[PDB]
Amino acid sequence: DDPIGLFVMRPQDGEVTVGGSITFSARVAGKPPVVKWFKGKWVDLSSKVGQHLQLHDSYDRASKVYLFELHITDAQPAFTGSYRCEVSTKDKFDCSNFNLTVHE
Amino acid sequence: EDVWEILRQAPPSEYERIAFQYGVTDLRGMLKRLKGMRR
Amino acid sequence: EDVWEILRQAPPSEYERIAFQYGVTDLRGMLKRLKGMRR
Amino acid sequence: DDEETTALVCDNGSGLVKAGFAGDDAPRAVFPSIVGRPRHQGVMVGMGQKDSYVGDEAQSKRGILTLKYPIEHGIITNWDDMEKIWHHTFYNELRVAPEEHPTLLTEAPLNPKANREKMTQIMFETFNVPAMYVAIQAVLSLYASGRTTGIVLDSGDGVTHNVPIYEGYALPHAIMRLDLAGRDLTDYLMKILTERGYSFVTTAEREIVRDIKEKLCYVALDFENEMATAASSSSLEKSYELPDGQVITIGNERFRCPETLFQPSFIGMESAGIHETTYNSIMKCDIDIRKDLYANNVLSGGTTMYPGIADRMQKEITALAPSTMKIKIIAPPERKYSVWIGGSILASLSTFQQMWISKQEYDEAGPSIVHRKCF
Amino acid sequence: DDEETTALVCDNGSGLVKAGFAGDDAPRAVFPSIVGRPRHQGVMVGMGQKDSYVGDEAQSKRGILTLKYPIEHGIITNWDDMEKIWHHTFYNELRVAPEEHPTLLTEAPLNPKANREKMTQIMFETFNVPAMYVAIQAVLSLYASGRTTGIVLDSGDGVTHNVPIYEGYALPHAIMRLDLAGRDLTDYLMKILTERGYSFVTTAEREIVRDIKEKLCYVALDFENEMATAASSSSLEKSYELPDGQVITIGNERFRCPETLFQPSFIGMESAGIHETTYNSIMKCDIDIRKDLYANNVLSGGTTMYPGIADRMQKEITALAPSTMKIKIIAPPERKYSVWIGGSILASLSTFQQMWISKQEYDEAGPSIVHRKCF
Amino acid sequence: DDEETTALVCDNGSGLVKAGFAGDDAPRAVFPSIVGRPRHQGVMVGMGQKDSYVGDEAQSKRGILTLKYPIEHGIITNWDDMEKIWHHTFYNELRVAPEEHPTLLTEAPLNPKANREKMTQIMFETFNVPAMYVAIQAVLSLYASGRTTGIVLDSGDGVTHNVPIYEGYALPHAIMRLDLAGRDLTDYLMKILTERGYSFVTTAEREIVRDIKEKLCYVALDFENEMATAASSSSLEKSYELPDGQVITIGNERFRCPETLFQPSFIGMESAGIHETTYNSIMKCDIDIRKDLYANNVLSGGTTMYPGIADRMQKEITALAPSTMKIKIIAPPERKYSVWIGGSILASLSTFQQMWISKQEYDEAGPSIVHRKCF
């Protein structure tokens, strides 16, 4: 589908509804890159990582694959917006943003 | 007291020294009433 | 185990340390059987 | 007609009063903590029809005789009840004079002092035992644990506390009770089964139900997938002979009774499960006691004898504990007696007779003596 | 519909959030820092049954609605809670737009920065106030003291620090916190009264107990002779109407609650009393500041409103201080508002608007701006 | 059961007391200089629960047992503490009679004499060692240096001095202490981490933190560019397993703990860094000793074991020293033992037994003897 950086899976361009618990996922063969959640530039997302902004993040030996994933429960237009997983190995970096549009 | 007149005639900021000299830890308050006047 | 001999030869009260060291949370029991013997 | 004496290892197991002696091995006393009142009085020739022989006979008189705990909430509301309870003990099953055999005294925390005050003096006057002594049921399971370090989870006869310990070292601050009693579970059981097609209120009706729990009612580790299991799992779907002779059918309850100890929502209680009471206690514990706990996660309380008891214990701690640390809850099968056992021990601890409550000591200091530097 | 603006003098008093304006005289906002959750949901026609209107209504909903501080330990665990807390403020009791009124921001030390980071930005976005500002609650009582020299003993809404000062000059090195909160005393109270014959755990049960402390619970200067006094002193021996309607009897507790602030043995805390925290601070202070302190021994914190507060303060310092020097602790009755008052002041300090947190400044430097050369 | 004797090379390393024998190679004694007090006393059967076996066991009893240095500030506030400390030594780990083995006695300068007076006599009475002797810890690292010329920078167990020397020739006038202790760094660490999101006050909590420093905390040569590095440098950004089992995250602290030894602003201390204490000392030194120093810039003190220790040492001297001269600080890895080592030496210096403190000499001249023409 869309182009892949690391992003063997890509946190999608969420055109969700309100309440659509949506999983923005970089399931990517994976030092394993650190992820950087961003809406805004001065503005983190970890201070907002909550039950509505939730993560499963775990590596695989069999496939050398690690899961960054973001389930979004109780989707709200307040969190309709841009979001980012800037991921970096010990050597590389990956910057490409993705969308949350909590429709309705 | 004269703290009233001496603070009104105190040096502009050093109402600090005069208020807290004449016991007015509420230079805070001296100014806050002066501010309810000058708000 | 030797807990038997080591508790019989344990320091008199510190059968505490020896029993509970060798897993004998029943130093309680070690003494209570020793007491059914020494009652 | 023998040597000095045997301390009296008398243990009012929150549901039953029990007891043996110092150095004993089995509480020769075990029986319900109830009082019983018939209603009707069919004019009946002759006599022998006691109002209040509950002890261990009155359940023979169940139905017509009602039920009375004195220490209903681990709270002795009345004592002449419990008084003759003792006498029953010491004269029918103890059938023994208090006056010449010492005794240690089982008690959970949270008691206002006069309870013990009164029990004490009266036990010297009515009883003239050579001397008494009292000891927290909690502590008495504690040594009873013998893992002097670590908490113990006392959810026993009908009781519930957490008992953080540490080579004998326990923090009362971190220590707690859970009002839950197997009686409580009893309750919700009545609630459910009755509303579910049953009319189950009567005292010994409660008797049967408690029997039901302690024989068949259990818990499954999980709930929600274990709920789907319940959704059709026929194996559970088992009816058990109601002691009328009925065969009371059973399904999801068997387990949906106890488990609420982790979710008093079902009892509606504002409280929290027994596991996280353990966990907040432990977090209260010092930084690295916690592994001590893990090795010392001693459960206590037979009514909690159900299946998976630790199974959950560990799984949720896990769910909360850092896998860094390795957990191990500790529960012997014999948790009822454990408390008795450790009490036997302590009292039987001959290097310890100095503590017992002497008639005199109380005499000079009345009962109030008990409190400071003694209990 | 008026001139430039009034800064928002918003003050989350460690227990209650409170507030007025710059130059104001009474925080028009005062109310609990809790969140509340009903349990049962009786199916109830219609609506209006908010989950979380705690603010100052939910204690009306006490019982069914539970309790939640965000800044539970003077530690905001959660913020949307506190978020709508603000909105409640600024829209029901402040019922006012943030966007057009500045505000200074009350805070105790010991906060990890991002707390303020987040609070700040969100207060500009959700709030678009003309500009904010933050200020240590401690400092804000400090000017609030106006004795720019000397320590202040901030044991307030639920907080505790020592604030050595010196014509505005304070040594953070010598500065300290005492985790104690009137909530903590609350705790030990529950401990005692409950175990002493009471069953007192529930959220608003805690409500009643805190009320109890803040209305009746006190301390006597002395303890041990004051203990003998307790031994029979009937005057104390007073029962107070439990707001059920009961009349909760009271004796030695009234005072044996707070006093442990000098002896966390009762809270079991490893810490030390608030007096010698003052004294070791002062000794840390320069050689002859100490007399400054003596004159400037400013207490702060209303929950500490109890009797003898200074009485001890002085007596023990004495017990420690050289009689050479003459001590004087300083505590207005109005210590709750004091912090608010001095904040009103500072923010209201028109020679000072340069400091307020401008939207832009944060915009260019994001939140991290806040930290250096600003707060 | 052997030949004449082995002097006792007993070394209260400012944090730990340590020791071997004359000619020994490893202080067979090493352990904390603390005393420990439990709080609660869970009534606990039996005994063996010492109040004060701190020695090297009580950290096993950490938490419930508190902490006590006698020589807290390199200042013995109490001595029976330290007394049984010795006995512990000489009877459990020394497990040896003082009376028959000599001993040299480690001490830093700045002591009021009676400290040694008392220690001395009591060490002859309680100890009856064949004879004692005392020696400045500083001097004892000095020979311990063996570069008889040059200063040494003793920032050791918890100590700090500059020790200008010169083929054994040292100028006390130029000689100095820096109150800093690794304990002090400990302090600021607690300050930071706690305020930074942590609640870290407890005695063994201090234990963990000191462990943290001595295992991971470091310093980078530079600061400001090394500050920008900190601004995002993820490599540092490492969390370390909190010995609860937590994994205490770590960043800029690791280094921002110690470095303040050059800038007590962070400790707020009026003092100055350890480097320019070296430099003003050296300038005090004669005109051309200074190159001697340069070659003899002997650091001492293991807690200073951190990275770059000399790195800075040299860079700043440089920044101050004339490049004309060539600098070389001198610090073995084994600086803890160094002091012990040189003491072993001296005491073991068989051409030197004349100095040891004989029972008699003290007897005729009491303790005061010690002072003139002897120590």
Coordinates of C-alpha atoms in Angstrom, one line a residue, chain D residues 73 108-116 171-173 176 179 265 268-270 371, chain E residues 39 188 191-192 194-199 201-203 206 264-269:
Chain D
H73 CA -18.2 -9.5 63.1
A108 CA -7.6 -10.5 65.9
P109 CA -6.6 -6.8 65.9
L110 CA -9.1 -4.0 65.8
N111 CA -10.6 -4.9 69.2
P112 CA -11.5 -2.1 71.6
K113 CA -9.6 -3.0 74.7
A114 CA -12.4 -3.7 77.2
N115 CA -13.3 -6.7 75.2
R116 CA -10.2 -8.3 76.3
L171 CA 4.3 -3.2 60.1
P172 CA 0.9 -2.6 61.6
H173 CA 0.7 0.6 59.5
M176 CA -5.1 -4.4 57.2
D179 CA -14.3 -7.4 56.4
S265 CA -18.7 -4.7 43.6
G268 CA -21.0 -3.9 46.4
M269 CA -18.3 -3.2 49.0
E270 CA -16.3 0.0 48.4
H371 CA -2.6 -3.4 78.0
Chain E
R39 CA -21.2 2.4 41.9
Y188 CA -4.3 7.5 62.0
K191 CA -7.0 3.7 62.5
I192 CA -7.6 4.5 66.2
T194 CA -12.2 2.3 64.2
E195 CA -10.1 -0.2 66.1
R196 CA -11.3 1.5 69.2
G197 CA -14.8 0.4 68.5
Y198 CA -15.7 1.9 65.2
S199 CA -16.0 0.9 61.5
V201 CA -13.4 3.6 56.2
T202 CA -15.7 5.1 53.7
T203 CA -14.7 8.1 51.6
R206 CA -13.0 10.1 55.9
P264 CA 5.9 9.8 63.1
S265 CA 6.4 6.8 65.2
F266 CA 2.6 7.0 65.4
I267 CA 2.5 7.2 61.7
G268 CA 5.5 5.0 62.1
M269 CA 7.2 7.4 59.7

